[PDB]
Enzyme design. Structure first.
Site, short mmCIF file in Angstrom:
data_model
loop_
_atom_site.label_atom_id
_atom_site.label_comp_id
_atom_site.label_asym_id
_atom_site.label_seq_id
_atom_site.Cartn_x
_atom_site.Cartn_y
_atom_site.Cartn_z
N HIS A 1 -42.98 45.13 -28.36
CA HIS A 1 -44.41 45.35 -28.12
C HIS A 1 -44.58 46.40 -27.05
CE1 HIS A 1 -48.57 43.44 -28.29
NE2 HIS A 1 -48.68 44.39 -27.38
N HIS B 1 -52.27 40.09 -31.62
CA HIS B 1 -52.73 40.07 -30.23
C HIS B 1 -53.58 38.82 -30.09
CE1 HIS B 1 -55.25 41.27 -26.77
NE2 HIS B 1 -56.21 40.76 -27.52
N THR C 1 -56.03 48.34 -28.82
CA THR C 1 -57.45 48.32 -28.87
C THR C 1 -57.94 49.61 -29.42
OG1 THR C 1 -57.58 46.84 -26.94
CG2 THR C 1 -59.59 48.00 -27.55
N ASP D 1 -45.17 44.94 -23.25
CA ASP D 1 -46.47 45.64 -23.34
C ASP D 1 -46.49 47.02 -22.62
OD1 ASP D 1 -49.11 46.10 -24.03
OD2 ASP D 1 -49.77 44.17 -23.23
ZN ZN Z 1 -52.50 42.76 -27.14
ZN ZN Z 2 -50.78 44.94 -26.07
#
Ligand code: ZN
Ligand code: ZN
Ligand code: ZN
Ligand code: ZN
Lengths: 381, 381
Positions: free
Chosen positions: B66, B200, B104, B288
């Site tokens: 990720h 997510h 996003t 992340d």
């Molecule tokens: Zn996420």
């Molecule tokens: Zn993320």
């Protein structure tokens, strides 16, 4: 096993190296060195398979730039659609790398079909790539453009079997042709892939006019244009020989013996090129495996071997002709790890006997044929 | 070079093997065997770098499922788009394989951007894959669907990171979700790839409802549903722990510092899972890296190593936690040649000092960091 030491091999790299030992480690060639008069100490915990080849010829695996891996045909009715070509038809003919394409029937078949078969062959242990596009314009593609296909689909290296000078072509204009070439060319810069357009040539009397004009009128480099079937008729072959001095690679089709039509058998075209002092590094040979050869007559990968035997049997040396099946093809297609027996290259190689028949075939460091016995078969063979 | 011999190395494979020597051949591990002392007699003709590590810890390289390899952000104006993450941000943190994704912002960023970066990182020597889609429905793809993206684009392994229970989600319906799941799942069958959907999770009270429901009402296997950020809040973490009994892999996010906020620091969540005797093979950890972490923080790959150190300082054993960065990831993503120190697997390895700092990093058999020094930089670092 992962380490393989091939002892006492007469290496054609394709360049003659004399008698050597070659260490394979994984899928790569790890070392090449003179064949010492005794043995070496191998540490015992290391799993190494040692094979003595008693001086047998060692060669790069053949790179076949023109195979209908899905099968070709379909030009005399739906029943003439050729089935997929099996793994062993490539490997037993000495082809360790294949580049698939669609031909005339790019209407019932798709680039989806083609690319899936590429990945099939990869899972079975063959190195495989393909051309997007086909004979016709507009192109058959996955994503809608040659550019996007070459950019985003790793195995796709160019545009291929795009037809000119043929009654089955799309009668493409010069403007169409140079736009296509601009797309493979730029995608090749983006990706480091061949970025060539592999032209199918037919028997039309305009021959290579489009390519000659593109190179003359335009900034597109000559190498971008790669015509095939150039031995299919005599006037065409003459023009293709002339084409060499611009920088183009040209590709002969190894037609089944006694079927070279009113053109040249590939073995005769090769001899002519040698006599004439043409730049031999710009000449390649492909099988047209899985294709139909119309007046029904079928292409197969084993004609590469036979063309090679036929040239040798004329008194041409192995080193003169072998690059046509190996390093010449790697050069134009930008396969930086293929086409040569050298340290750091992939361990794709063949062993031949005195008669030049292929007894052993290794692809990515794994044996597919050994002592003339099939070791690896395709899933449905 | 082509062969490298790692001597005197305390292996966690991730499971503890004790002291070994390890032979690397090209990009693969070829031999692992008992260290012992005395000779090692290597042939003079065979190029082999020998390196002694004096008992130091050796692990597989971290696989980060990720990572915003193109950069994430863009959630508080156009100036908050993170730039692309340099190669060393991954390698200096022990990540030898990365799986990139859009977050996003899947409006101004494209799968074309993402995929191009995957190939960028491959050229620089990292192993890299990606998820197609992104937060939103309809999905952001190259070809027009996830099915055909997963099928035809080799590095694409599934769909992610698809948002549920978040104020930034597309408020997807259950029908929408199971249709996406059927898409990756089947493509995973066609290709042998992961065939998962990486979700997510936000802070929505509905939490994992839609996944619980898919698993209960449909035939889709549990492993298809792979929620991440499961530690972002405490109710979500409890529900995710319950989800392990269904067969799902769940993914913790290594939030930096004291930024786990109202949820759990990854180190605490891991401790809790060990205390509760949950199935630990089904728990993974991702960074992340390159993402924004708004209420605004930044993800980076080095949080992985930090989370590891924090978990060993709690008294947990290395072999208990290590699989969550390595073999457990390779298992859910079907990276059959990664995540383990075993013969035949890819040579992706870390060396650590006694304080669990990474002193060396090997990716595909190439050193990117040796003895605390950077050996390879990204093209623009
Ligand atoms: Zn996420
Ligand atoms: Zn993320
Ligand atoms: Zn043709
Ligand atoms: Zn053809």
């Amino acid at each position: 096993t992962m380490l393989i030491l091939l002892c006492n091999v007469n290496i054609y790299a394709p360049n003659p190296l004399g008698i050597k030992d070659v260490l394979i480690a994984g899928n790569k060639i790890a070392a090449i060195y003179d064949h010492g008069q005794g043995e070496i100490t191998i540490p015992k915990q290391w799993p190494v398979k040692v094979i003595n080849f008693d001086g047998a010829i060692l060669t790069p695996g053949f790179i076949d730039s023109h195979a209908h891996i899905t099968g070709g045909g379909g030009q005399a009715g739906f029943a003439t659609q050729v089935p997929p070509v099996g793994l062993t038809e490539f490997t037993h003919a000495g082809v360790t790398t294949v580049v698939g394409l669609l031909g005339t029937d790019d209407t019932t078949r798709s680039t989806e079909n083609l690319l899936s078969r590429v990945y099939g062959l990869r899972e079975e242990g063959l190195s495989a790539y393909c051309w997007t596009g086909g004979y016709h314009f507009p192109l058959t593609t996955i994503t809608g453009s040659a550019k996007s296909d070459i950019a985003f689909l790793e195995p796709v290296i160019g545009i291929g079997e795009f037809a000119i000078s043929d009654h089955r072509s799309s009668q493409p204009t010069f403007e169409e042709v140079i736009r296509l070439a601009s797309e493979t060319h730029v995608a090749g810069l983006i990706t480091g892939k061949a970025g060539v357009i592999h032209f199918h040539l037919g028997d039309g009397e305009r021959r290579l006019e489009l390519i000659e004009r593109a190179i003359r009128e335009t900034e597109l480099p000559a190498r971008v244009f790669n015509p095939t079937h150039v031995n299919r008729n005599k006037p065409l072959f003459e023009d293709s020989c002339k084409l060499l001095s611009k920088g183009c690679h040209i590709d002969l089709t190894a037609f089944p013996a006694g079927t070279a039509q009113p053109g040249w058998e590939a073995c005769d075209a090769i001899e002519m090129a040698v006599e004439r002092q043409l730049p031999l590094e710009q000449i390649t040979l492909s099988s047209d495996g899985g294709g139909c050869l119309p007046c029904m007559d079928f292409g197969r990968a084993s004609t590469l071997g036979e063309t090679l035997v036929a040239t040798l049997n004329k008194g041409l040396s192995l080193e003169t002709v072998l690059p046509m099946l190996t390093s010449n093809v790697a050069n134009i297609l930008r396969f930086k790890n293929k086409g040569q027996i050298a340290v750091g290259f992939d361990a794709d190689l063949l062993v031949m006997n005195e008669k030049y028949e292929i007894t052993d075939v290794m692809a990515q460091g794994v044996w597919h044929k050994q002592n003339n016995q099939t070791m690896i078969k395709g899933t449905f063979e």
